[PDB]
Design a protein around this nucleic acid. Structure first.
Ligand SMILES: [Zn+2]
Length: 241
DNA sequence: CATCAAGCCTTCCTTCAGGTGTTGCTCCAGAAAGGGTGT
């Protein structure tokens, strides 16, 4: 649970592909896992093709991919975790907005790992740290790393629900972009500007951009009740094996 | 050759026309994995 690559042995159980070399000499960290490849640990020379665009998120320049990250770099394990949270018991999907409501309000207490895709398929899982504490979640979204606090998320939800009590039409205080791509992502609306107090406007400005991205999946009009995603670790284990 | 009248009045705008149609975006921003083949 210390490194993201621990979702290969502890969870989504798999072994080395056995065409891998055995590490020798002084230990070096893996280029993808950030895990130290010790002596006697299975590793591959880094045979990444030219379509690998995640050099900026490589942990080290060792050119040595650990076997756990070889399993992490498998394409079924790439697209199978396009929207997933990997707890210690299994992998769950966060594609639905109710699933992100369960992820970002009352999250599971495990040292989980939140990976999400801003595109069709990205080298996504190895570059993001594990969320050891529940209150600080390291989300990976596309090319960016994101930090989400569940309690501040519930505070923003309480404010957003409170400012729309007694109104027939549900109006958002602040626009947030699901792609986290618009210029107005984080810009407060004029209904929100006329409704929210300045302390609450500075509160909605004070949240992390990962929290803005999360609130985009959970500030829409048809407000999502937090519901657990269906367990997909059997699905991605079958796709892997 | 000098004044002496060296203007007066009253008109002093009228009627519609005072848009119509159409465009009113397109696409992509993946990267293995399985095959080739070219030095
Ligand atoms: Zn590694």
């Amino acid at each position: 649970m210390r490194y993201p690559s621990d979702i290969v042995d502890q969870v989504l159980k798999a072994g080395p592909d056995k065409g891998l070399l055995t590490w020798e000499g002084v230990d070096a960290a893996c280029s993808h896992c950030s895990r130290p490849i010790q002596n006697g640990d299975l590793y591959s020379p880094s045979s990444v093709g030219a379509f690998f665009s995640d050099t900026r998120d490589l942990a080290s320049t060792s050119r040595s991919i650990c076997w756990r990250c070889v399993v992490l770099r498998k394409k079924p394990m790439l697209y199978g975790l396009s929207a997933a949270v990997v707890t210690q018991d299994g992998i769950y999907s966060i594609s639905k907005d109710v699933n992100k409501a369960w992820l970002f309000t009352t999250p599971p207490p495990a040292p989980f790992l939140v990976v999400h895709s801003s595109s069709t398929m990205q080298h996504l899982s190895w570059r993001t740290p594990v969320t050891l504490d529940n209150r600080r979640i390291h989300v990976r979204y596309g090319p960016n790393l994101f930090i989400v606090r569940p309690e501040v998320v519930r505070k923003a939800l309480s404010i957003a629900d409170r400012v729309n009590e007694g109104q027939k039409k549900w109006v958002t205080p602040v626009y947030f972009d699901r792609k986290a791509a618009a210029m107005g992502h984080g810009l407060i609306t004029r209904a929100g500007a006329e409704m929210l107090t300045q302390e609450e406007q500075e509160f909605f400005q004070s949240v992390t951009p990962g929290e803005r991205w999360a609130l985009s999946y959970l500030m829409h009009s048809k407000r999502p009740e937090p519901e657990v995603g269906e367990c997909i670790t059997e699905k991605v284990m079958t796709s892997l094996n």
